[PDB]
Structure formats: C-alpha cells, structure tokens
C-alpha cells in the first residue's frame, strides 16, 4: 500500500510500470494536499524513465484533475505534463498533448491566460523539434478562453511555428491548422490564417502540401462563400495540378466533403474541370480515389444542372474508366456506378449505363463483378423488372455458374429479389434449374446460401408451391452417394421446416430424415441428429413420441461418440427422453 511510493523508485522496469498503474490508488490514499505538495513535484524531478513508463504515466496523470483538489489547483499537473510532451518518442508525445488538451478545459480563463499560455509559449520556443510538435496541438483548445492580447500572442506563436524551417514542425502545424482556424474568429482567419495556409500549400515537401490540402476543407467551411474565390480557390487550383501524386490523391479523397463545403456554384466552375483532370490522372491511385468519389460528387450536384453535368462532363470519363487497364480503378468504379442510375433516370440508365453494366459484368476481374452485382437493386428499381429481365437476366444466368465462388455467392444472395419481382411462374420456368443446381455446388458457402435462398423463396411463394416444386427435388437429392449432398439435403430440410408448416413437414420431411438416420456415414448420422433437434418443435408431440424418439434412441447407441453426443443433446433439448 504505502510501499508503492518507494516502489516507484525501484529499478525494475515492470514493477515501476505496475506502480505507475497504481498511481491513481496511491494518490487517492495520499490526499489532494500531500499529492500536490510532494508526489507531483517528485514526478517532475524523476520524469526521465523508459518510454513505456513515460507513456503510462502521461495516461494516468489525465484523471488527476479531480485528485488534485479540482480546477482550483489543476495547474500543479502542468509542469509534469510539459516534461512528457518533450519526450522524443511520438506515442508518449501524443498522450501528453491529449492530457494537456483535456486539462486546458478545467483551468479557469485567468489560469489559462496566466499559466497555460506561457507553458505553450515555452513549448513552442523549445530548442528540440519535439517541443514545437507538441505545442502545435495546443493552440486550438486554449485560444477561445483567453484575452485579446493573449490571443494575438498565441496567433504570433502559431505563425512562427508555421514558418519553422523544421519539416516535421511544419507538418504538425499544417495538421493542426484546421483545428486552430475553427476556434479563431473569421476576421483573423481572413488576415492571418489564410497566408499561413497559402505558405504551407506551397511548401517544399509534399508531406506538408497534402496536410494543407486536408485542412483546406475546414478553411473553406469556416469562411463565407464569397471569400473562397479570392482567398482559397487559387490555392486549391494550384494544389489540384501539384506535381506530387500524393497531393492529387488527397484532393481526390476529400473531394466529396470539399465540393459540399464549397457549395454548388464553386463546383460547376472550379471543381468539375479538376475532377475531369483527376479522373484521367497518370497515377492509378488518384484515378481509383476519384472513381470512388464519383457517386458522391454526382449526388451532391445542383438539381438544375446535375443531369447535364453528368451526361457531358462525367459520363464519357466513366465510360473510359470502365475499360481501364488497372484492376483497382475498375473495382472502385464498379462499387459506386449503380448509384448514378437513380440520379440519371430510367431512360438515361438503359441508354448509357446498361452497356457499361454488361461490359463490367463480363469483366475478368472478380472484384468488378462482385461490386456490380451487389448494388443491382438500384437499377432494378430504376428501370423496373421488365427491362432488367430483358437485359440483365442473361448476364445473371451466366454469372450464376461463374468460376469464382464469391460471385456466385453474391448473385445467389441477390436472387430472391428477382424471384419475387418476376413471379413464381417465371422463376419455375427459367430460374428454378439454377437454384436447384446451386445445391450440388462443390463450395459449402454456395450450398448454405442456396439453402437460405430456398427458405426465402418458399416463404415468399407459400408452402403449397414449395411442396409441389422444390420439396420433391430436394428429397430425391438424398440418394446422392457423396455425403456432402446429403448434408445439403438435411440443411435444406432444416431451413424449409419452419416455413412449410407442421402438416407438410410431418408428411414428407420427417420420413426422409428418419430414412437418412440409417445412413452408413457417421457425419450424416449426427447431422440427422442435428436436423431432428432443429425441426423437433414444429412437429406435434404425438408424431414426435411415435417416430423420432426410438430413432434418436437408436442413434444414441451409434459407435461414433459425436453421433451419441448429438443424439443426447437432441433428446434432452426436446424433452422427449
């Protein structure tokens, strides 16, 4: 208990870490007065320690705001916290800066203007870059609760940090530029922040230019619309054509939030051309990001010009990117191409997107096909079931037996929608063969998806059609010599039992399952045990006791211990005993 204060000075690393973890308890025992008077100064004098002990201590000192008697004496934590911010390692530096940001809220405004602001002035003036990097993340939290002169001093310090010759400090300043500009008043933003943003966006290293572009969205959000064309728009246009591919990638990634922040008028004149250039960029990653963000840009376009702007300036580039050499660009475009069908309308979809859809359906890239099939419900709703069946259905049936199993999984998981839209008669005439053949597929996941699809179809089309059409084919699939297909039949019976009703289940499903119980393979035997446990409640007690009881009893005597255990579980859960 009281020994932990001496254990803090023990040489052992792990014991020191444990005592740092117990620091909260020790300090609770000490009391606010003795903790502040003795423990806190002790930490500052002995701060030098292994980086792991430093990081753990910085995390622990976070909840000390109350253990120091409250905000009246929260300043006692400012000297220990500052030393942790100096530590060269990054992870401890981030914990220290987070702790200081949390503590800044507790301090009274006079405390901030008298204690916290000098601390960050000292951190910003530290000789080592770490001090300046830590200080870069503190101007935002303490700025609003200070006075005008202090605010001007804080601004000057931030300007000095931005104009630092150290690349890493400039990187940190560019990272925190948006957060600092949020708290800053708009009049100051126009006069002081904008020059800093322009300077950072023209930095020698692209690692700073990308962060400047990243903060550009917050800068645009803060300012009013009329100021963008004169203060930020030239800066962003210069960044859209920047040599480094990384700046162009950062522009593409945040393009949706950017145009939304700029509004419609800025987008039609200064951004649509930039997106066109960005879509056809030399670098593949930039093209992939732009193709990913195409649906969001097309969705946030002004209503008056959306259709025209997509038709003329966007659609040809989408057509070109459809046949792009790189696979990632095609996969990214295929994931959000279906989103533009609702926007464009039925006639425009069948006139332009359908050819592209067909082209992407036959593409050799598995990811492209998977992405295209996943969002086909949008096109189904846009153009109706008739046009989809006239155009997409051959592609659907072709992909139903594709080599890649995941594509088959996607199309099978989407099939019930088609079955519902086309009606039961059409599914029986044309699609039933495919659904029935999906059961004997070599991939277990396809078989499970087919079983779920069967459950969905018989619950959609009722029990009668199920018994007329699907029940026989499945109950005949049992004879297959391969045990995997016997497992498939048992799984299908399990899924169909809930929907078929008690009468149909007891009449046809039960005899097949009882016959399978006598199968030579143990795997099918205990699977039968599982099936009887699952479909047990549906059947009435009379039929249960009459038939399944001596069957589960016979199975309980099987040589396989798995069959025994599963038969016991089934006989216990159903209380048949």
């Amino acid at each position: 208990i009281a020994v932990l204060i001496d254990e803090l000075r023990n040489e052992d690393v792990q014991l020191r870490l444990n005592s740092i973890k117990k620091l909260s308890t020790i300090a609770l025992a000490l009391g606010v007065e003795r903790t502040r008077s003795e423990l806190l100064p002790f930490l500052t004098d002995t701060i030098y320690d292994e980086d792991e002990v430093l990081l753990a201590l910085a995390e622990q000192l976070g909840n000390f705001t109350g253990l120091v008697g409250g905000p009246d004496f929260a300043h006692c934590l400012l000297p220990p916290l500052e030393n942790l911010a100096t530590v060269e390692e990054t992870v401890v530096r981030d914990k220290a800066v987070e702790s200081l940001r949390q503590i800044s809220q507790e301090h009274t405004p006079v405390a901030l203007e008298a204690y916290f602001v000098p601390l960050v002035k000292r951190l910003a003036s530290g000789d080592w870059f770490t001090s300046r990097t830590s200080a870069c993340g503190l101007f935002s939290v303490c700025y609003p609760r200070a006075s005008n002169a202090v605010k001007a001093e804080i601004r000057q310090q931030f300007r000095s940090l931005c104009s630092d010759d150290t690349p890493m400090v400039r990187r940190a300043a560019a990272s925190k530029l948006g957060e600092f500009a949020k708290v800053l008043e708009l009049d100051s933003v126009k006069s002081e922040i904008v020059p800093l943003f322009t300077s950072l966006a023209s930095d020698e290293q692209d690692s700073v230019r990308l962060l400047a572009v990243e903060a550009c969205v917050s800068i645009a959000q803060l300012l009013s619309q009329d100021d963008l064309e004169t203060l930020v728009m030239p800066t962003l246009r210069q960044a859209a054509e920047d040599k480094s591919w990384r700046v162009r990638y950062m522009v593409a990634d945040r393009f949706s939030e950017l145009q939304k922040a700029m509004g419609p008028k800025i987008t039609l004149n200064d951004l649509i051309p930039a997106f066109q250039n960005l879509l056809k960029d030399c670098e593949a990653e930039v093209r992939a990001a732009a193709a990913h963000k195409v649906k969001e840009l097309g969705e946030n376009l002004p209503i008056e010009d959306r259709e025209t702007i997509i038709m003329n300036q966007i659609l040809p580039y989408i057509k070109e990117l459809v046949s792009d050499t790189n696979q990632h660009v095609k996969s990214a475009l295929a994931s959000v191409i279906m989103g533009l069908s609702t926007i464009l309308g039925k006639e425009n979809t069948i006139e332009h997107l359908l050819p592209l859809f067909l082209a992407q359906l036959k593409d050799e890239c598995p990811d492209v096909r998977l992405n295209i099939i996943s969002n086909l419900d949008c096109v189904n709703e846009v153009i109706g079931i008739r046009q989809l069946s006239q155009s997409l259905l051959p592609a659907i049936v072709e992909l139903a037996e594709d080599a890649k199993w995941r594509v088959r999984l996607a199309i099978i998981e989407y099939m019930p929608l088609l079955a519902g839209q086309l009606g039961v008669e059409f599914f029986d005439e044309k699609l039933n063969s495919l659904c029935m053949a999906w059961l004997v597929d070599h991939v277990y996941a396809i078989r499970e998806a087919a079983t779920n699809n069967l459950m969905k179809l018989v619950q959609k089309f009722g029990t009668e059609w199920a018994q007329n059409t699907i029940v026989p084919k499945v109950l005949v699939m049992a004879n297959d010599p391969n045990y995997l297909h016997r497992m498939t039949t048992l799984f299908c019976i399990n899924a169909l039992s809930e929907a078929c009703g008690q009468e149909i289940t007891t009449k046809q499903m039960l005899p097949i399952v009882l016959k399978m119980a006598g199968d030579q393979v143990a795997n099918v035997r205990f699977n039968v045990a599982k099936s009887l446990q699952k479909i047990g409640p549906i059947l009435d007690t009379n039929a249960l006791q009459g038939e399944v009881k001596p069957v589960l009893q016979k199975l309980g005597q099987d040589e396989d211990m798995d069959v025994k255990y599963f038969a016991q579980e089934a006989i216990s859960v159903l209380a048949l005993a």
């Binding site: 292994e50 980086d51 199993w405 391969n482 995997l484 795997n523 396989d560 211990m561």
Partner: protein
C-alpha cells in the same frame, strides 16, 4: 462431462473471430489435446469420407476461406498435413483453433506434424515473436511446441492414400517402419523422421541431396517402388509450394497440395484442397485468398 465441451465450443466460436485466448486457456487446451494425441499411432487410420488440407502457415483469414469451401469443421471430416505456425501474421489463432477443433472433435479432424512444427524452425521464423507479442512471454510458445512434439508423422486414408506433410525417405522402406519411428521428439536434424517431413519429389530418378538444408529428393522410380511395396495407390504431401495449389507428379503416384493462398502474403499462389468421398474418388477444390481490409515500440515490456 459436457461443461468442458461447451467451454470448448465457446472457445472455438471466439477464435472464429480471430480473437486469441488467454495463457491459461491455451495451456489447458494444449494439456487436454496432448492426452488424445499421445494415444494416436504414428500412422493413423482414416475413414473413407475425408477432406485433406495442405499447409496453411498461420494465414487465419485464408483458413476461414478454406472452411467456407470444404465445410464446417464438425460437419465435414478434415485432415491437415502440417506447417500451420509460421510465415503468418495470425499464426497463434490459427494453430490454437486447429488444436481446439482436434480436441473437441477427434474423429472429425486429424492434424499432422509439419517440418515447420519444430522449436528451431518456429523460432527462426515469426511464431516465437508472435507469441511474445501476443502474450508477453514464452509460456504459450512452450506449451504449443510441447504439443507439437506429440503430433503424428503420417496418416493413411482407407489404406489406399498415404498422407504425409513432407516426402518419402531412403531409410524408410515400408509403412511398418514409419510406425516404428519414435515421433515424441523435436524433428531430428538428420534421420528417417527428418526426411519424412523435409523430402520433396523430383525428376532426377534417384535419391539426391535436397536443395533444402535437410532431407533427400525421391525420383519417380522410388515413389513407384514404395507404392508397389506398400500397396498404396497415391501419396499426398504439402511441403513443396505449388503455384497451382495442387500438383500431379511421378505419373500421378504423388500429389503436392498447398492450401495457403497468397503464401507469405507475396506469392499470390491459388490454394487447393483434396476431397475423398465414400468411393475415395479424389476431387480438388481450388480457392483464392479471403478479401482483406503507429505500432507499439518493440522494446515496450
């Protein structure tokens, strides 16, 4: 008592989400699995319906991908040749899940020793470092290697298929010899067990120094002689990486199956597994890797 069975079911369910267990949990799991593994002969009889799987090398997401193709581990009989601890960023979860499956369902799944399943190979590769990172000590590593010491060397499917991770050995002549070998030891650097796990098939027509540090290379004639003497019709192995994932060699007298797709995350090989039905008609299922989506300092301890 079924309470431990239910606890094992919970452990398997947790591991299916790539969440490793605790030190005590894995220790108890390995202690339980050793009891059933030490009761297994060097060559294990296998029922006719069984799906044989090659090396997985701790690629856990690809292992879940494999389980999707073949089937649920309890539902479908599975046979793992070896090498499920190295060259993987999720080796611990993979190996502990395999061991949990083996103890929960001894009949439905059998695991076979690989060349990688030895202290030296596991240490020179990332498994020891992985255990250190995920548990902060070598206790779990020690338990796992002690269990690996009890793994069988070979399995026999209905007497017609011979399942061994590595290859045939010059010292070994007939299966009776393999039964004689004492497998409760770390892979001998040189010897019959070493060659059994380190050998490779080749077209040089004779025993020859393997390019690998240990073992020899068996010619087509050697394989044919071994099958004729032992009455075997096919030998399945997984030690050699095959870009195809499945390979027919020595006039279809030997087959190399690699079940680790995108090996080392860099090979980009399409993996494959073997499935044997009641009529032992062999069929190969090939699959591709599962889709995928500041660090702590190395001196933090």
């Amino acid at each position: 008592e079924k309470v431990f069975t239910k606890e094992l079911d919970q452990w398997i369910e947790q591991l299916n989400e790539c969440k490793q267990l605790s030190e005590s949990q894995v220790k108890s799991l390995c202690e339980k699995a050793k009891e059933i593994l030490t009761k297994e002969s060097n060559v294990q009889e296998v029922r006719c319906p069984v799906t044989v799987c090659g090396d997985v090398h701790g690629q856990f997401h690809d292992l879940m991908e494999l389980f999707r193709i073949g089937g649920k581990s309890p539902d479908t009989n599975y046979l793992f040749m070896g090498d499920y601890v190295d060259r993987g960023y999720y080796s611990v979860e993979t190996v502990t899940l395999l061991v949990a499956l083996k103890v929960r369902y001894r009949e439905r799944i059998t695991i076979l020793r690989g060349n990688h399943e030895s202290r030296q190979i596991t240490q020179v590769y990332g498994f020891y470092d992985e255990c250190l990172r995920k548990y902060g000590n070598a206790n779990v590593w020690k338990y796992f290697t002690d269990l690996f010491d009890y793994l069988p060397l070979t399995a026999l499917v209905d007497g017609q298929i011979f399942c061994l991770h590595g290859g045939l050995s010059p010292s070994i002549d007939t299966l009776d010899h393999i039964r004689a070998l004492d497998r409760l030891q770390e892979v001998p650097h040189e010897g019959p067990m070493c060659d059994l796990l380190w050998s490779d098939p080749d077209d040089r027509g004779g025993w020859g120094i393997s390019p690998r540090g240990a073992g020899y290379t068996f010619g087509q004639d050697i394989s044919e002689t071994f099958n004729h003497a032992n009455g075997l019709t096919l030998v399945s192995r997984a030690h050699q990486l095959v870009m195809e994932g499945y390979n027919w060699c020595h006039d279809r007298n030997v087959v190399t199956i690699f079940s680790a797709p995108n090996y080392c995350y860099r090979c980009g090989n399409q993996a494959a597994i073997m499935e044997l039905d009641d009529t032992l008609k062999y069929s190969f299922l090939q699959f591709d890797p599962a889709p995928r989506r500041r660090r702590t300092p190395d001196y933090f301890l």
